[PDB]
C-alpha cells in the first residue's frame, strides 16, 4: 500500500498537529531520515490516535 | 502487511498528474469505438490479403 505525501500536506500536519513537528525536530536531524520518520509515524499508534 | 510511503517536495506532482491523464486517455482509447463502426466502409476498397 502506498500513500502520497506532498510538502503542503507535511506543513498542514506540522501546523495542525504540534506533536508531529515536536517529534520531527528531535528525530529527523539527529537519528533517522525524513521518509523513515514518516513511515515510523504512519506505522505508529500516535497516527491512529 | 507492508507500509510504503511516497514523499513529494511540491515539485513532482505534475509527473503523476500527467500519468493520471495519460492513463485516462489510454482507457478512453481502449474503450473507444473502432474506426469501421463509426465510419462507412462501402466506398473504400474490398477486403483481401
Amino acid at each position: 500500500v502506498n500513500v502520497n505525501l506532498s510538502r503542503e500536506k507535511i506543513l498542514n500536519i506540522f501546523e495542525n498537529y504540534p506533536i508531529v513537528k515536536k517529534a520531527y525536530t528531535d528525530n529527523v536531524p539527529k537519528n533517522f531520515k525524513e521518509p523513515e520518520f514518516w513511515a515510523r509515524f504512519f506505522s505508529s499508534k500516535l497516527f491512529r490516535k | 502487511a507492508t507500509l510504503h510511503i511516497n514523499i513529494t517536495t511540491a515539485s513532482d506532482e505534475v509527473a503523476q498528474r500527467e500519468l493520471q491523464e495519460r492513463q485516462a486517455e489510454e482507457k478512453r482509447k481502449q474503450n473507444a469505438v473502432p474506426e469501421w463502426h463509426k465510419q462507412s466502409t462501402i466506398g473504400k476498397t474490398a477486403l483481401g490479403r
Partner: peptide
C-alpha cells in the same frame, strides 16, 4: 512470524529512505 513482520517493516522503511536519497 513476529521477527519477519519486524524485519520486513524496518527494511521496507530503509528501502524507502534509500530510494528517497537516490532520487534526490
Amino acid at each position: 512470524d513476529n521477527i519477519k513482520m519486524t524485519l520486513q517493516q524496518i527494511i521496507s522503511r530503509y528501502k524507502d529512505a534509500d530510494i528517497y536519497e537516490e532520487k534526490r
